[model samples]
Target: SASPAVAELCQNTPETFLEASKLLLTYADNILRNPSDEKYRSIRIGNTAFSTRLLPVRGAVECLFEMGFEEGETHLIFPKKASVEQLQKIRDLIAIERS
Candidate 1:
């Protein structure tokens, strides 16, 4: 089977997930890289033109599933925080992919 051109340019594989992660980071980096006064902005990614307001975690999870990844083949990566323990909880609830 052949992957669509859209999937090719964009990050579609877990091997290319780091690239997809960069897309999410670009949004925050836009605000952070700016000096002096702080600001806020919204960025959207996906195939649609409309602003679906797809969140990182939800979007990543949904995309992985849509890409034919099983529960055991999915892993979540994000910044560390007190509430971040939820990641492990989620991973435990859903088996993770092995290397």
Candidate 2:
């Protein structure tokens, strides 16, 4: 099954979410392009910039979860068991949702 959260987030409000998809894309794209980098895999769940954009949206975090990001106390971590292809496909879904 697919993660309905990503599509729901996009469908909830096109203009606002439309803008967010790019940010989400870059976040995922970073890891997709640089899989070995833990920094790209770790997104802060507190303290900063993400709050201004991606964090607050209802389905946004869940979208990450569906793509294999497990919640950590301070950050969202994509651990070793998570799939790169899953991340890429999730990123691909966001690409379509972006439009």
Candidate 3:
């Protein structure tokens, strides 16, 4: 089953930057709250794929980047350096799916 936020992302494109940020925050929160599930942190809309580049929490940042957001624009929402535990968790969540 998909998280409610994930389902909404599949069906909607945010109309504003703030809306996109909110959606990203929701996606990030969902990732942190839920167990590792393929559906939790990754989605494809049309030809583009939305997934975290470095951390589970970066999904929102990546999504905004894909939507042509500039660095200064998404700075507030970007993921910072990951702790060892966070790095491991993100790797575990996404690595298996890549193989």
Best prediction by TM-score: 2
Model 3, which residues run further than 4 Å from truth?
1-15, 47-99
Report the lDDT tens digits of candidate 1 across residue range 1-99: 232322332444554444443443343344345423223232223424212322333344443233332232122223222122332233222222211
Ranking by lDDT: 2, 3, 1
Cα lDDT for residue 42, candidate 2: 87
Candidate 2 Cα misplacement greater than 4 A, ranges = none
In the range 2-84, model 2's lDDT, one tens digit per residue, is 66878677765877786667667888888888867778988887647676778877677777887788988888888889998
Locate the minimum summed-lDDT window of 10 residues in model 3: 46-55
Local distance difference test, each candidate:
0.32, 0.79, 0.37
Candidate 1 lowest-lDDT run of ten: 90-99
lDDT (C-alpha) at residue 64 in model 1: 29
- RMSD (Cα, Å) of model 3: 13.0
Model 2 Cα shift for residue 9 (angstroms): 1.0
